[PDB]
Symmetry: C5
Subunit: 69 residues, 5 copies
């Protein structure tokens, strides 16, 4: 899967349908993997750099691969 | 869903029916999504600013959408 | 449910039977709600003030309502 | 259950069979309760003092009761 | 099980099939044990030194034993 965006988590959002949204770089992407929620919040809180890998690299895109640096 | 309140979590409460209550701004709101409990406590401990989005924007109101900034 | 004790978490104990015990004020109380284990440990580690609400307000008493400040 | 060892967590080990091993004092003890893994790691990371209670108070001994302070 | 690599966690990666990848030393290894994900991220965030024990000691290798110091 190709890299989509890399950077710090600007904000996260829990959604009504139980998905989780993250804002990295200039993209707002969401995921439906439950384990990623607390992991992504930890990344946000501790200010790590993350790379999101996805084919749907656009606002509203979904993803399920993340690299925590 | 519209913004209801934005600010720091003053306090949280675990309820007998397992729902979770949060006090942000001047509203006391609750949620029945189990994943939000630890996330909201982290938000509280680390002092993040959160925005709660809900139609039931009033004390005793319920919610399931949150933005962590 | 009435207030029972308020204060910092003196210590916590994971029990053989999988219940969780907390020492706040002069009472030692236990709960069987899982989600409360990690939440209570976080409260302990970060030095939060908690209020436990329960009718069984006595050593060995059970509880399932907690307020985290 | 009697006290076995008290002190800081010197190290923890995740084992191939999903049990968790902890080194406190001069004993190396393991547990099969899944909830205790993250709790014990938090204890280790934050440098808490823990007391492990068990009858198998010897290297290779098992346990399921822990006091966190 | 023999030691494979020891060092801090360079980065971690959540994979689409819900396995978790970690980069320690010069090896990139992955695990399918769900409990290790948050534990490894904590290790990464807090900069602990970990030792991964495995027979598949090579890039792409799996593992399920970890020592956190």
């Amino acid at each position: 899967t190709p890299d989509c965006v890399t950077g710090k988590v600007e904000y996260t959002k829990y959604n009504d349908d139980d998905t989780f949204t993250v804002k990295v770089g200039d993209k707002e992407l969401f995921t439906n993997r439950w384990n990623l929620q607390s992991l992504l919040l930890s990344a946000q809180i501790t200010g790590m750099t993350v790379t999101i890998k996805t084919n749907a690299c656009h606002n509203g895109g979904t993803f399920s691969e993340v690299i925590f640096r």
